[PDB]
Design a protein around this ligand. Structure first.
Ligand SMILES: Cc1cc2nc3c(=O)[nH]c(=O)nc-3n(C[C@H](O)[C@H](O)[C@H](O)COP(=O)(O)OP(=O)(O)OC[C@H]3O[C@@H](n4cnc5c(N)ncnc54)[C@H](O)[C@@H]3O)c2cc1C
Ligand SMILES: Cc1cc2nc3c(=O)[nH]c(=O)nc-3n(C[C@H](O)[C@H](O)[C@H](O)COP(=O)(O)OP(=O)(O)OC[C@H]3O[C@@H](n4cnc5c(N)ncnc54)[C@H](O)[C@@H]3O)c2cc1C
Lengths: 126, 126
């Protein structure tokens, strides 16, 4: 017909303020990448710090409906920051809660180390 | 000649682990966007929380040379979290320190509200 609601076909300037979706994509990348490299045997101070980091992220996330949704989840399901394995998985399952809320499919949590740190075992990241 | 070191011409799969540069781009977007919507008159608890959030981000940032560089800066130049105006500018000038370290030009701090929240006044984000 003429205009389109597919943003990629419309708004071409990259250096603009992130919208709700684009901030989401950046933020999941930041959180999953921070978790991917977290210690396998973190100190007690690290475990405390990472839980506080996720709590503070929930206080300041600037999409208010998204931040409320996050604060509700963290109240029902505190972050497991005991180890890399536990925290990476914990964060995957949380991300999946949001995906299911929004009508998106589940990400296979078995893929989190490939996806965010190591690259796919088939070599498609090289 | 044949291979290229311009990543865009080589590695086409998007769902791969962020490298140092790509994590940087995501992270500056997250930090500048969080600052852009921070209160103009934050409570004392908010001011304390935002400073602690930036400190914790420096503890967990997974590029070790980058995290060390950040920890050094925050020791010399604590975040000003007193107001949106102060914190957005504080974070711009910090980002500029990193840009100059890496041979990149200064971003004009007068542009931070346009860039990260409001869109350019000429309408090029619409
Ligand atoms: C904490 C948080 C709360 C949010 N709350 C809301 C909200 O309440 N309402 C709303 O409209 N939007 C919310 N958003 C934005 C939303 O989650 C999506 O980021 C946005 O809709 C863009 O979706 P996307 O399809 O690009 O993929 P995203 O969900 O942004 O995912 C980005 C990439 O991460 C990978 N991935 C997907 N799922 C997982 C997983 N479970 N584990 C590991 N990797 C995964 C995939 O490679 C994917 O392409 C929130 C985002 C954040 C960060
Ligand atoms: C906290 C932190 C520390 C880092 N330390 C290092 C390091 O020690 N060594 C290293 O090699 N890399 C480091 N990086 C990565 C580096 O800063 C860049 O992110 C990366 O090199 C990609 O650069 P870029 O050209 O894509 O633009 P980036 O610097 O990633 O900037 C992204 C976008 O932000 C906007 N912008 C640029 N400057 C400002 C500013 N001053 N204020 C507001 N908006 C701005 C521009 O629109 C720009 O395109 C760090 C990143 C972070 C987040």
């Amino acid at each position: 017909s003429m205009r389109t609601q597919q943003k990629r076909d419309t708004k071409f300037r990259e250096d603009x303020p992130p919208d709700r979706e684009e901030l989401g994509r950046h933020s999941w990348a930041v959180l999953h990448t921070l978790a991917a490299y977290y210690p396998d045997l973190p100190t007690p101070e690290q475990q405390q710090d990472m839980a506080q980091f996720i709590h503070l992220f929930s206080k300041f996330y600037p999409x208010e409906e998204x931040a409320e949704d996050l604060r509700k989840r963290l109240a029902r399901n505190h972050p497991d920051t005991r180890t890399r394995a536990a925290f990476t998985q914990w964060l995957x399952h949380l991300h999946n809660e949001v995906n299911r809320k929004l009508g998106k499919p589940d990400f296979d949590x078995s893929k989190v180390d490939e996806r965010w740190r190591d690259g796919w075992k088939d070599g498609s990241x090289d």
